[PDB]
Structure 1
Amino acid sequence: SATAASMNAVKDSLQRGQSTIDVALAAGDTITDLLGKMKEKALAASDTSLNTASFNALKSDFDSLRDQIEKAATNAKFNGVSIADGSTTKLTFLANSDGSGFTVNAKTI
């Protein structure tokens, strides 16, 4: 029965891992949308028939969107630990009542 109590201890760690990955996924969706918009801006600015005063506007839009991606990426922490900023190489959660782990590598975005 001691082992059943330990399983009760394991389930919370599994749930916490789920939560961190959800936060990362939300930030990632925002980042992918921003990247699409940045591609659109760069494609529009690649035109050689463009005026000198529109190129600057498109460049400033690009720069704003890049700063946005950076902010959106560094804010995606749950409980101080995150798998999208690039702070650590992997996160290991509990998976067995004897200590063996569930490994989740880090996917910096």
Structure 2
Amino acid sequence: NALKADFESLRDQLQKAATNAKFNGVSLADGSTTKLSFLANEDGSNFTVTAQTL
């Protein structure tokens, strides 16, 4: 039971670390969105950055 409680605590801390790590109201780790698309050209073609949910 002690090892199980350690597993529960680490599993909850994993979500607490994943959800809170976000820059300027958006994140590439929490999985709230599939991708972010930053500018690459004067034309406006985006540099896609696929999100990788953690």
TM-score (norm 2): 0.95
Q: 2:32, 2:4 → 1: CA distance?
A: 30
Which residue of the partner structure matches residue 87 of structure 1? 32
Q: Could you give the per-residue CA deviations for residues 22-57 of structure 1, whole angstroms, max 9, x where no partner exists?
A: xxxxxxxxxxxxxxxxxxxxxxxxxxxxxxxxxx11
5+ residue gaps in structure 2?
none
RMSD (Å), alpha carbons: 0.6
Deviation of the 1:107 alpha carbon: 0.2
Which residue of the partner structure matches residue 52 of structure 2? 107
Deviation of the 1:101 alpha carbon: 1.0
Q: 2:29, 2:22 → 1: CA distance?
A: 8
2:17 to 55, 63, 72: 72
Q: Percent identity between the aligned chains?
A: 80
TM-score (norm 1): 0.48
5+ residue gaps in structure 1?
1-55
Structure richer in strand, relative to its length: 2
Q: 1:77, 1:102 → 2: CA distance?
A: 19
> Structure 1: which 4+ aligned runs deviate by more than 6 Å?
none
Structure richer in helix, relative to its length: 1
Q: Secondary structure at the match of 1:93?
A: strand
Query: Greater relative contact order: 1 or 2 (C-alpha under 8 angstroms, separation 6 or more)?
Result: 1
